Design a binder for these strands. Sequence first.
RNA 1: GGAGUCGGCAAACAGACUUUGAUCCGGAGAUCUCUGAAUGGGGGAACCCACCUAGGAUAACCUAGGUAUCUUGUACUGAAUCCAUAGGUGCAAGAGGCGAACCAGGGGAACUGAAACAUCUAAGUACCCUGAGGAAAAGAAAUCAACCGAGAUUCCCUUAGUAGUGGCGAGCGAACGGGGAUUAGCCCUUAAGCUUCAUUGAUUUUAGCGGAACGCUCUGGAAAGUGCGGCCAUAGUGGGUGAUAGCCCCGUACGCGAAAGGAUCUUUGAAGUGAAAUCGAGUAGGACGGAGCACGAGAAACUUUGUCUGAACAUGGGGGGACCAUCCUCCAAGGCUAAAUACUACUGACUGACCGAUAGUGAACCAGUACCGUGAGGGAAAGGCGAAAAGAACCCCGGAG
RNA 2: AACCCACUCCCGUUGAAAAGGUAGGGGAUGACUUGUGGAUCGGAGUGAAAGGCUAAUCAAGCUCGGAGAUAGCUGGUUCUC
RNA 3: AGUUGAGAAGCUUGCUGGAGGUAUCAGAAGUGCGAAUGCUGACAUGAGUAACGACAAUGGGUGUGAAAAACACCCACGCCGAAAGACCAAGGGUUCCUGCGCAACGUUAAUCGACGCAGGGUUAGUCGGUUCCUAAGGCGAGGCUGAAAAGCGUAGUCGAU
Lengths: 94, 61, 103, 44, 77
Amino acid sequence: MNQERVFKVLLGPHISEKATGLADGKSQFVFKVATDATKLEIKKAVESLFSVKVQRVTTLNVKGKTKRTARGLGKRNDWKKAYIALQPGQDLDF
Amino acid sequence: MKANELREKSVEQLNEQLLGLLRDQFNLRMQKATGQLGQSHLLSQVKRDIARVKTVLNQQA
Amino acid sequence: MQKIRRDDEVIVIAGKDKGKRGKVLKVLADDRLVVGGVNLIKRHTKPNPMLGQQGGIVEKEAPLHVSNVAIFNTETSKADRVGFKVEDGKKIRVFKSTQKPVQ
Amino acid sequence: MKRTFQPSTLKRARVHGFRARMATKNGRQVLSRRRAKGRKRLTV
Amino acid sequence: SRVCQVTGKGPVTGNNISHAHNKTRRRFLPNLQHHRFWVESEKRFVRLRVSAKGMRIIDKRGIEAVLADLRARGEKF
RNA sequence: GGAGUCGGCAAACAGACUUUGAUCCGGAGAUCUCUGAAUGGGGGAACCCACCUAGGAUAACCUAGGUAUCUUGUACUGAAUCCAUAGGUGCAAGAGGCGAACCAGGGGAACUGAAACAUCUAAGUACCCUGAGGAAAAGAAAUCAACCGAGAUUCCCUUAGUAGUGGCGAGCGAACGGGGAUUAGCCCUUAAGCUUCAUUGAUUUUAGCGGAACGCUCUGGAAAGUGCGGCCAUAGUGGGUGAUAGCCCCGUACGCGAAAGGAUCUUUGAAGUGAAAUCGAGUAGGACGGAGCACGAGAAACUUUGUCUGAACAUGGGGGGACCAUCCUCCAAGGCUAAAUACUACUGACUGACCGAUAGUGAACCAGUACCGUGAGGGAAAGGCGAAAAGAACCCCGGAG
RNA sequence: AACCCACUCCCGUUGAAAAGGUAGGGGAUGACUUGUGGAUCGGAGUGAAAGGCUAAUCAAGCUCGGAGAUAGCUGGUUCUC
RNA sequence: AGUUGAGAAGCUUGCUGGAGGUAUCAGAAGUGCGAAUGCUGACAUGAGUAACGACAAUGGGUGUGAAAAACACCCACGCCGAAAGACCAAGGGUUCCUGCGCAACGUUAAUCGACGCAGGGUUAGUCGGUUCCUAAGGCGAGGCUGAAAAGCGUAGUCGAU
Ligand SMILES: [Mg+2]
Ligand SMILES: [Mg+2]
Ligand SMILES: [Mg+2]
Ligand SMILES: [Mg+2]
Ligand SMILES: [Mg+2]
Ligand SMILES: [Mg+2]
Ligand SMILES: [Mg+2]
Ligand SMILES: [Mg+2]
Ligand SMILES: [Mg+2]
Ligand SMILES: [Mg+2]
Ligand SMILES: [Mg+2]
Ligand SMILES: [Mg+2]
Ligand SMILES: [Mg+2]
Ligand SMILES: [Mg+2]
Ligand SMILES: [Mg+2]
Ligand SMILES: [Mg+2]
Ligand SMILES: [Mg+2]
Ligand SMILES: [Mg+2]
Ligand SMILES: [Mg+2]
Ligand SMILES: [Mg+2]
Ligand SMILES: [Mg+2]
Ligand SMILES: [Mg+2]
Ligand SMILES: [Mg+2]
Ligand SMILES: [Mg+2]
Ligand SMILES: [Mg+2]
Ligand SMILES: [Mg+2]
Ligand SMILES: [Mg+2]
Ligand SMILES: [Mg+2]
Ligand SMILES: [Mg+2]
Ligand SMILES: [Mg+2]
Ligand SMILES: [Mg+2]
Ligand SMILES: [Mg+2]
Ligand SMILES: [Mg+2]
Ligand SMILES: [Mg+2]
Ligand SMILES: [Mg+2]
Ligand SMILES: [Mg+2]
Ligand SMILES: [Mg+2]
Ligand SMILES: [Mg+2]
Ligand SMILES: [Mg+2]
Ligand SMILES: [Mg+2]
Ligand SMILES: [Mg+2]
Ligand SMILES: [Mg+2]
Ligand SMILES: [Mg+2]
Ligand SMILES: [Mg+2]
Ligand SMILES: [Mg+2]
Ligand SMILES: [Mg+2]
Ligand SMILES: [Mg+2]
Ligand SMILES: [Mg+2]
Ligand SMILES: [Mg+2]
Ligand SMILES: [Mg+2]
Ligand SMILES: [Mg+2]
Ligand SMILES: [Mg+2]
Ligand SMILES: [Mg+2]
Ligand SMILES: [Mg+2]
Ligand SMILES: [Mg+2]
Ligand SMILES: [Mg+2]
Ligand SMILES: [Mg+2]
Ligand SMILES: [Mg+2]
Ligand SMILES: [Mg+2]
Ligand SMILES: [Mg+2]
Ligand SMILES: [Mg+2]
Ligand SMILES: [Mg+2]
Ligand SMILES: [Mg+2]
Ligand SMILES: [Mg+2]
Ligand SMILES: [Mg+2]
Ligand SMILES: [Mg+2]
Ligand SMILES: [Mg+2]
Ligand SMILES: [Mg+2]
Ligand SMILES: [Mg+2]
Ligand SMILES: [Mg+2]
Ligand SMILES: [Mg+2]
Ligand SMILES: [Mg+2]
Ligand SMILES: [Mg+2]
Ligand SMILES: [Mg+2]
Ligand SMILES: [Mg+2]
Ligand SMILES: [Mg+2]
Ligand SMILES: [Mg+2]
Ligand SMILES: [Mg+2]
Ligand SMILES: [Mg+2]
Ligand SMILES: [Mg+2]
Ligand SMILES: [Mg+2]
Ligand SMILES: [Mg+2]
Ligand SMILES: [Mg+2]
Ligand SMILES: [Mg+2]
Ligand SMILES: [Mg+2]
Ligand SMILES: [Mg+2]
Ligand SMILES: [Mg+2]
Ligand SMILES: [Mg+2]
Ligand SMILES: [Mg+2]
Ligand SMILES: [Mg+2]
Ligand SMILES: [Mg+2]
Ligand SMILES: [Mg+2]
Ligand SMILES: [Mg+2]
Ligand SMILES: [Mg+2]
Ligand SMILES: [Mg+2]
Ligand SMILES: [Mg+2]
Ligand SMILES: [Mg+2]
Ligand SMILES: [Mg+2]
Ligand SMILES: [Mg+2]
Ligand SMILES: [Mg+2]
Ligand SMILES: [Mg+2]
Ligand SMILES: [Mg+2]
Ligand SMILES: [Mg+2]
Ligand SMILES: [Mg+2]
Ligand SMILES: [Mg+2]
Ligand SMILES: [Mg+2]
Ligand SMILES: [Mg+2]
Ligand SMILES: [Mg+2]
Ligand SMILES: [Mg+2]
Ligand SMILES: [Mg+2]
Ligand SMILES: [Mg+2]
Ligand SMILES: [Mg+2]
Ligand SMILES: [Mg+2]
Ligand SMILES: [Mg+2]
Ligand SMILES: [Mg+2]
Ligand SMILES: [Mg+2]
Ligand SMILES: [Mg+2]
Ligand SMILES: [Mg+2]
Ligand SMILES: [Mg+2]
Ligand SMILES: [Mg+2]
Ligand SMILES: [Mg+2]
Ligand SMILES: [Mg+2]
Ligand SMILES: [Mg+2]
Ligand SMILES: [Mg+2]
Ligand SMILES: [Mg+2]
């Protein structure tokens, strides 16, 4: 993929209790990714942008929540989540 | 970054101006998600500099 | 242009504070002005413990209509109207009574 | 007791869907009639 | 359709009237048949769907003149 | 242009922008995801799977272009079959879909009226379908008149609810002749006109700029109202400002305006078209069955055609309401043509003896929404604190209600 | 027995239910029952035929138009002298 | 409230209200309601009456809390068990879990909830689709037919159960 595509696939870290537990006991890092990204381009961007060795990526789509308001029924955006597993010993810092 | 000085550059210079702006935009989004983004006005500022470089790049043809 | 600008010396015509002299601090949309030292109010602010803190009774000026003030002519010590002198190359504001420029 | 409406998402689309209406010129009259009145849905 | 291919006759509509003078809609159709015409220049038979009036015209003006008109208005004969 | 700004419901907290000209308004550009005529192939609309060319990477691709169907023209190629035809590929140019009404055509009801009902009416209306345009259509006498004449087409007012027509019932309903709106004709021995370019000038539209003249006094929370005296006028019954303002603000009469696009009218140069070749033959006329003419077969002329026939050539042909004679008046079977006329989904201005929240649009409010139905489709309710949030700090009862 | 059906009584009838329940009843390897996908419809379809069924609607569905059909028939028709 | 006319009606005033009204004589009408099993909204009577939805069934202790028959835990008792237990498909669409709540919703109360607010949660070369193949059937270049719309159909390409 061209050099503009690497800067647009990762959106940022996902912060949660599940995400924090995986970063310690499994060296597994959760990211928010573009909704049209694929496993192969996610893998390359992480390697290029953070300069580490990644072994496997698993991905899931998340449906946005629907909230009822006085003026109707609105819903939030759908987003995509990536579980990124690194080499046995190494960290993903910024 | 006004367009007048952008027009003073070459095509090869403007592509690395463009490429260095996308890196800056990535750092701001990474820093926003974590939470240590103090100046939130930088997000929209970099977007319009990217749109400005692409305009002058297309004008070169 | 607009006849009443920011930081102009004005006098209040009509209203509770008719006759007071002030200085324009802010020009609002739908032709309202905030003039320093006139038309004071007191807002009673509930200090909710959540969302940080707040105040008690705050003091501030309430806006008044733009046509309720007049430019002050500091030569005759009276209110006045302003027109726009024909531009030699620049628009300027003049007093209608004496045709001197406002400064 | 069995009631008249037995849902089926595949059969709903094949009878009343957008492509089913676009196939015939009488279906296309329905779509232009619903665009004229300002319907938000226009098709199910 | 039921349209003559050299004159343009098609179906037309009208009425049937009874003795009590009741009216019902009807159609009048051209008297059209299939016929192969010998074209001398090309040494082949051309088959057309023409009315009996169209065959009278071909006899009067020849098939070469009539076929020119059919090409002139672009008819797949 | 000339100091504030980061759209609204809809506020707060932040981060910023700037007289080195921001926000905002107008002209021209750039970018313009997916679906939809949707057009590379499929599909349950907003989804799935591809191929070809050029360039770039080394892994499992990227970037930019192409790839629907039909019609027209062109180049090559080529079956039964020798020739050459059908057919097959490649290029160009065009079309396709949407839109309230108006226009020209194709198809075409019934309820109802007749105090029943078949002919008749409703009505060639409703409805469905197809083409075109900013208008369309029609238009330059094989026309009327009446022995005197008129002079293409369209639209309005009369003639006149008359002459006719009609189970002579219910009903339908002209023309001649007048008064007006408009003004115009030109070609097949090749024209007016109309398109598209290129030029000559003018005018408008898309933004803006200036724009006169008031003080004192009383009541009042607040004067624009009371009382007293002035001024402006090509601007004096506009809007709103703390109650009723020509002189407080925005305006108004009146004057100026445009880097750049649009449109209209205007010169003069080109290309095209008009265009059908040469004055009109399966045509005029006729027989049978229908339709149209106000006219329902009636003494029934005239137009048109589904079926079948079928002339003359200016000493010739058509019409003048059966038909004949005599007169009169036109020259059909080839074309083009503005204005007066129709309509408004849409944009601007102005106006109203129109409505004012059960009214006026279904809809003043986040309405073709909520809701109802499998669907087509049906379809609501719901406005107002105050001049200004100054929207009630603090205390007490109560569940930190 | 399951499964498909619906002969009898009672209850319920403003129901728990716009056709049910408890207790009994019939068929239960067949002209059987059932899921998914598909085809035929308005003077039309389908019917081992009851004028049955075609979205709780059928001696001619629903929806929108002609359309404010027509109604010698019922009902109503608003201040004063 | 008073008062004046034969009447429809008029006039004068106290209180409320807080910004508009219209003498006289003319002109123009969406011009006057008790009824139409009238239309829309509000509120009565029945009446604090019927009912609170399978007659498997509940009793104590403790905690929390403003408040406990119903919430949580414990000790007992009852019911289902070819289901009233588990799991696929269709259909639904966040109802799932955790903090904070109880106005409305729950046929009673509720500290509880499929309820309100805010966060979190769904990880596939092998499961199910997609991709490959076809059935009934659909569409269908050319084609044949038909006033028009369109009908049928060949090559083909869609369609799982
Ligand atoms: Mg997923
Ligand atoms: Mg997955
Ligand atoms: Mg449409
Ligand atoms: Mg008839
Ligand atoms: Mg497409
Ligand atoms: Mg397609
Ligand atoms: Mg194409
Ligand atoms: Mg496609
Ligand atoms: Mg060919
Ligand atoms: Mg078109
Ligand atoms: Mg239209
Ligand atoms: Mg027609
Ligand atoms: Mg017509
Ligand atoms: Mg006709
Ligand atoms: Mg009739
Ligand atoms: Mg009758
Ligand atoms: Mg009658
Ligand atoms: Mg009768
Ligand atoms: Mg009759
Ligand atoms: Mg009869
Ligand atoms: Mg008729
Ligand atoms: Mg018609
Ligand atoms: Mg058109
Ligand atoms: Mg035209
Ligand atoms: Mg048009
Ligand atoms: Mg046009
Ligand atoms: Mg015109
Ligand atoms: Mg014409
Ligand atoms: Mg013409
Ligand atoms: Mg004469
Ligand atoms: Mg003439
Ligand atoms: Mg009679
Ligand atoms: Mg006449
Ligand atoms: Mg006349
Ligand atoms: Mg402009
Ligand atoms: Mg101005
Ligand atoms: Mg002025
Ligand atoms: Mg002006
Ligand atoms: Mg006024
Ligand atoms: Mg007031
Ligand atoms: Mg005023
Ligand atoms: Mg004043
Ligand atoms: Mg001639
Ligand atoms: Mg004839
Ligand atoms: Mg006849
Ligand atoms: Mg006749
Ligand atoms: Mg008769
Ligand atoms: Mg004759
Ligand atoms: Mg003849
Ligand atoms: Mg004749
Ligand atoms: Mg003669
Ligand atoms: Mg005669
Ligand atoms: Mg005549
Ligand atoms: Mg002619
Ligand atoms: Mg017309
Ligand atoms: Mg107009
Ligand atoms: Mg009201
Ligand atoms: Mg309303
Ligand atoms: Mg309404
Ligand atoms: Mg429904
Ligand atoms: Mg629905
Ligand atoms: Mg049965
Ligand atoms: Mg018993
Ligand atoms: Mg039983
Ligand atoms: Mg059995
Ligand atoms: Mg058997
Ligand atoms: Mg058997
Ligand atoms: Mg059996
Ligand atoms: Mg089966
Ligand atoms: Mg089906
Ligand atoms: Mg069908
Ligand atoms: Mg029917
Ligand atoms: Mg039948
Ligand atoms: Mg039967
Ligand atoms: Mg039947
Ligand atoms: Mg019977
Ligand atoms: Mg149903
Ligand atoms: Mg139904
Ligand atoms: Mg039924
Ligand atoms: Mg019937
Ligand atoms: Mg009618
Ligand atoms: Mg009626
Ligand atoms: Mg009746
Ligand atoms: Mg009677
Ligand atoms: Mg009665
Ligand atoms: Mg009645
Ligand atoms: Mg009063
Ligand atoms: Mg007023
Ligand atoms: Mg009056
Ligand atoms: Mg009224
Ligand atoms: Mg009314
Ligand atoms: Mg009334
Ligand atoms: Mg009444
Ligand atoms: Mg009443
Ligand atoms: Mg009454
Ligand atoms: Mg009653
Ligand atoms: Mg009634
Ligand atoms: Mg009543
Ligand atoms: Mg009612
Ligand atoms: Mg009671
Ligand atoms: Mg009782
Ligand atoms: Mg009792
Ligand atoms: Mg009881
Ligand atoms: Mg009960
Ligand atoms: Mg207990
Ligand atoms: Mg209990
Ligand atoms: Mg058992
Ligand atoms: Mg159980
Ligand atoms: Mg279970
Ligand atoms: Mg599902
Ligand atoms: Mg549901
Ligand atoms: Mg929810
Ligand atoms: Mg939840
Ligand atoms: Mg839960
Ligand atoms: Mg809790
Ligand atoms: Mg309580
Ligand atoms: Mg409740
Ligand atoms: Mg409760
Ligand atoms: Mg209950
Ligand atoms: Mg919840
Ligand atoms: Mg097939
Ligand atoms: Mg087909
Ligand atoms: Mg075809
Ligand atoms: Mg397939
Ligand atoms: Mg399968």
